[PDB]
Design a protein around this ligand. Sequence first.
Ligand SMILES: [Ca+2]
Ligand SMILES: [Ca+2]
Ligand SMILES: [Ca+2]
Ligand SMILES: [Ca+2]
Lengths: 141, 29
Amino acid sequence: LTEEQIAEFKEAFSLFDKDGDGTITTKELGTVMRSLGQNPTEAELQDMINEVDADGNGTIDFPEFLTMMARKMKDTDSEEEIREAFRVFDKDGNGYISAAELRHVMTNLGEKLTDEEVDEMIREADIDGDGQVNYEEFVQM
Amino acid sequence: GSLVRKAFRHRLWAVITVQAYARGMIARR
Ligand SMILES: [Ca+2]
Ligand SMILES: [Ca+2]
Ligand SMILES: [Ca+2]
Ligand SMILES: [Ca+2]
């Protein structure tokens, strides 16, 4: 329960709270998850909403989200989360992250980056110079 | 019923991880 974790939890919560009301509905949780390549059913979305909503008001506020995310923490530098992060960036599933893919993901996180900025990120990471980023280069990044 | 708890965390940690690398990529460049 460090300050770093709290900041990361807050940034995740703001991304999901698409209208800024301080809560996360079922449709918000759906919409953000699919923007990042996940394919949850409406059945699991309602279930995740009911599990985390403690007071039963039908939505998830930040303390409720915080209670949930504070237990059983995984690690963003773990190869398990690195693997799951590669699934997001490599959207078409060919095993290489392209600039349009990085552009599309950055767009879904709320970043307004020009195409030159994105191309620089690819270059700074592209070791073999093939113009894309594979798993090895993604990890070393 | 704690499978749902597990799945929420897993889905969320992927988002947190993605955000962390997007921030870090912006941080390098
Ligand atoms: Ca909301
Ligand atoms: Ca609630
Ligand atoms: Ca790809
Ligand atoms: Ca490459």
